[PDB]
């Protein structure tokens, strides 16, 4: 629409049921010294049956990014922001925060996430920032940090970023990777059978600020690394800390796919 002006779309997520062609979209501007003196942002939901003026508009209190949805339902939607302030919205009101996840002590940093855990018969979440402190929040009842562990690298430079984390396509007991932006993919499990230090993998070898991460589906577990302007394919073993099907060194610095 002609309000979708001066506002980069810095995500698009897709609605999860089958024959609902809706898209939830997510519009922002970073490098915030040119934070736009105009529009405070409000994302949207478009439909493909008609290119309708956005069915519902979600108005946040700050710059919406990364706005994932709620899993397999026609009700609810999450979001991210720039403070750290998560958000949460239902479909029968075109308004602001249904349950704004508040400020508490730790997470006061830009969030590129709103990632769901498979907490059955309920809802859940986690975040990631340019401080490190990946900080799980609550389920259904929302206001508390569940397993609020500021994570820490083994040799104590805990400002370890992330983007675009991926879970398990085999039933999902909390094994995941975090797309850490300094050129080193990290990984975790959260069930510390060991002490609380459980960040095994630094897969150093990708280049510069990483922008891609995805497991592969449809048969196996081989994950991807499309982040910098080389588009690899990586593998998860303790002996293969290096690609498998490296593909082309490109022009035009890469930024994202799956």
């Amino acid at each position: 629409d002609p309000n979708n002006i001066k506002r980069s779309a810095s995500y698009v997520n897709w609605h999860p049921d089958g024959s609902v062609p809706k898209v939830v979209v997510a519009y922002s501007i970073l490098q915030f010294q040119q934070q736009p003196a105009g529009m405070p942002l409000s994302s949207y939901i478009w439909d493909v049956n008609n290119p309708n003026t956005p069915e519902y508009e979600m108005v946040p209190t700050s710059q919406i990014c990364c706005a994932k949805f709620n899993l397999k339902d026609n009700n609810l939607v999450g979001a991210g922001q720039y403070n750290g302030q998560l958000a949460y919205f239902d479909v029968r009101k075109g308004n602001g925060p249904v349950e704004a996840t508040p400020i508490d002590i730790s997470h006061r940093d830009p969030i590129y996430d709103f990632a769901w855990l498979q907490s059955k018969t309920g809802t859940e979440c986690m975040t990631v920032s340019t401080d490190g402190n990946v900080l799980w929040w609550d389920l259904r009842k929302m206001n508390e940090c569940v397993e609020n562990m500021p994570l820490k690298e083994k040799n104590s430079e805990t400002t370890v970023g992330g983007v675009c984390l991926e879970y398990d396509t085999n039933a999902g007991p909390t094994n995941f990777m975090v797309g850490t932006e300094q050129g080193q993919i990290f990984s975790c499990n959260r069930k510390a059978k060991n002490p609380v230090d459980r960040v095994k993998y630094v897969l150093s070898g990708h280049h510069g600020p990483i922008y891609g991460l995805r497991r592969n589906p449809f048969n196996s577990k081989y994950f991807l690394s499309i982040g910098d302007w080389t588009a690899r394919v990586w593998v998860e073993d303790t002996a293969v800390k290096t690609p498998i099907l490296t593909t082309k060194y490109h022009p035009t610095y890469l930024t994202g796919g799956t």
Binding site: F32, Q33, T130, E157, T159, Q182
Partner: peptide
């Protein structure tokens, strides 16, 4: 403020790497 604290964190991250 936000620029300069983010910057100090970021070349600080660089200068210990």
């Amino acid at each position: 403020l936000v620029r300069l604290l983010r910057e100090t964190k970021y070349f600080l991250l660089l200068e210990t790497s």
